[PDB]
Ligand binder design. Structure first.
Ligand SMILES: Cc1cc2nc3c(=O)[nH]c(=O)nc-3n(C[C@H](O)[C@H](O)[C@H](O)COP(=O)(O)OP(=O)(O)OC[C@H]3O[C@@H](n4cnc5c(N)ncnc54)[C@H](O)[C@@H]3O)c2cc1C
Ligand SMILES: Cc1cc2nc3c(=O)[nH]c(=O)nc-3n(C[C@H](O)[C@H](O)[C@H](O)COP(=O)(O)OP(=O)(O)OC[C@H]3O[C@@H](n4cnc5c(N)ncnc54)[C@H](O)[C@@H]3O)c2cc1C
Ligand SMILES: COc1cc2nc(N3CCN(C(=O)c4ccco4)CC3)nc(N)c2cc1OC
Ligand SMILES: COc1cc2nc(N3CCN(C(=O)c4ccco4)CC3)nc(N)c2cc1OC
Ligand SMILES: [Zn+2]
Ligand SMILES: [Zn+2]
Lengths: 228, 227
């Protein structure tokens, strides 16, 4: 028995991202997995890292330091409940899938805020207690990303460089840092450009990949994998 | 005369980032430059890309495509005023400095939202206006970043890898894509582990570099430079 959290960042249910999220839910549900979706836009999820994220007495009220104050708030249980709600979902999950359109070679800001606010020190990592010693060790993570650019454009000799270059901050700097084993990303290239058959193909490839997701090995989340 | 925009993303005026922003203001002001600051947290800047970003009625209110709708709204002068306020500052600027602490090998979400919302198709880029021909060509951009990790931690065979690895999505994927010439980043490594005198010295060095900022050449913003 397995628990899956899908962190989903798209404004439009009828979008290609919406379809990818829906087939994920359908297929994991069919397998008998426990499935939860955090639909960040529908939740109006707060992306800003602010002093509103701590409800208790601040450790240093004269000079506000977000990292210091959230680490302390986590230990004291004085974090805002929207953060601790998300942390519960992550804690219980065996696999976390991020479903999002690529925005400026990265996640949309609303999802960036989820990373900034939910993955605090004490919960997701400590110093020491990061990368292979990260606190979310034992969990799997997977990026399911859609692009405007074609696969052509995302090659080493294309304008945008290889797709793996833009994965580094997310796969390594965030997920690996927190101790996740990272599964190979699912990149669905340029669905707005693609034909009807090509889009249906991309949806079914994801659906089909999910059938055997629990048999996959993680990537070696290293500089060499990303950059060669 | 030169116009500079500083897009600043820290919650605390007394912070190390705050000090770096303040010396940039002081030094560029001393030089006679026109200086504007967008203090994102103080503005409570909206980071979410939503249909609220378009005023009046939408191009296709059945299926919402942010990219399409904001491109159309830009062309039809129908974007929310927080966005168009920022676009005016960017249009008039000769240099845009981004002052921020590194969050997860990237910009804080509030700053990511400025990028997502302000740099829309029609304003910052178009077909064929991207990279070398991007719509903001002729402008300079500069990332001034503070980190938790020391410089040693950010070496090519360090835990965190090379600094330039994380710069790629920001410098190339974003700024170069819009046509900016990118100046070398100012990276202020690990202010929190001090010393109080060593912090003084990083602030001073940023100020010193700003003295000759207009003489500098842009980096070659290529896969090669970063990797
Ligand atoms: C601020 C911003 C920054 C961006 N930065 C980048 C960037 O840095 N690099 C880059 O490459 N791109 C970038 N993009 C482009 C962006 O990544 C794409 O527009 C997005 O990935 C497309 O996914 P979508 O779900 O919105 O597509 P949609 O427009 O929703 O889908 C395309 C088509 O697929 C159809 N569809 C939906 N479901 C199905 C289904 N079940 N079967 C068949 N068809 C279906 C839809 O009806 C639609 O016609 C950026 C976009 C924005 C707005
Ligand atoms: C969500 C999150 C994600 C993060 N992700 C990363 C990451 O991926 N990689 C990484 O390396 N780090 C990361 N960090 C750490 C972060 O980048 C550092 O905490 C930050 O850059 C420190 O900058 P600051 O301005 O807040 O320092 P401050 O705490 O504000 O500065 C340190 C000291 O400088 C003092 N000071 C202020 N002005 C001056 C002055 N002019 N002269 C002398 N001293 C002065 C202050 O009083 C303070 O004591 C993350 C932090 C958070 C909260
Ligand atoms: C090559 O890399 C990039 C590609 C991008 N594509 C788009 N779109 C989204 C909409 N498209 C369409 O097919 C389209 C046409 C009509 C309706 O929809 C593709 C262009 N928007 C961006 N902001 C991009 C940024 C990039 O690099 C930073
Ligand atoms: C190696 O790369 C990383 C370094 C990090 N350092 C910190 N600090 C900054 C240094 N601190 C301090 O001296 C300190 C101690 C007490 C108060 O302040 C706080 C933790 N916080 C993060 N979130 C980091 C994330 C990283 O990679 C994703
Ligand atoms: Zn890694
Ligand atoms: Zn470049």
């Amino acid at each position: 028995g397995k628990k899956v959290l899908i962190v989903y960042a798209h404004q439009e249910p009828k979008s290609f991202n919406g379809s990818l999220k829906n087939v994920a839910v359908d297929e994991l549900s069919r397998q008998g997995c426990t499935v939860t979706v955090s639909d960040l836009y529908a939740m109006n999820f707060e992306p800003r890292a602010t002093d509103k994220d701590i409800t208790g007495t601040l450790s240093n009220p004269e000079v506000f330091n977000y990292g210091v104050e959230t680490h302390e708030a986590y230990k004291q249980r004085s974090l805002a409940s929207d953060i601790t709600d998300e942390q519960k979902k992550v804690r219980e999950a065996d696999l976390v899938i991020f479903q999002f359109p690529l925005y400026w070679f990265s996640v949309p800001a609303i999802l960036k805020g989820w990373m900034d606010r939910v993955l605090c020190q004490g919960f997701a990592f400590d110093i020491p207690g990061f990368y292979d010693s990260g606190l979310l060790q034992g969990k799997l993570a997977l990026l399911s990303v859609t692009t405007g650019g074609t696969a052509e454009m995302y090659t080493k000799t294309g304008v945008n460089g290889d797709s793996r270059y833009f994965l580094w901050p997310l796969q390594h700097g965030t997920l690996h840092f927190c101790g996740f084993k990272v599964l190979a990303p699912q990149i669905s290239f340029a669905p707005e450009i693609a034909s009807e058959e090509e889009r249906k193909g991309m949806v079914a490839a994801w659906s089909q990949r999910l059938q055997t997701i629990w048999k996959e090995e993680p990537i070696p989340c290293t500089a060499h994998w990303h950059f060669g």
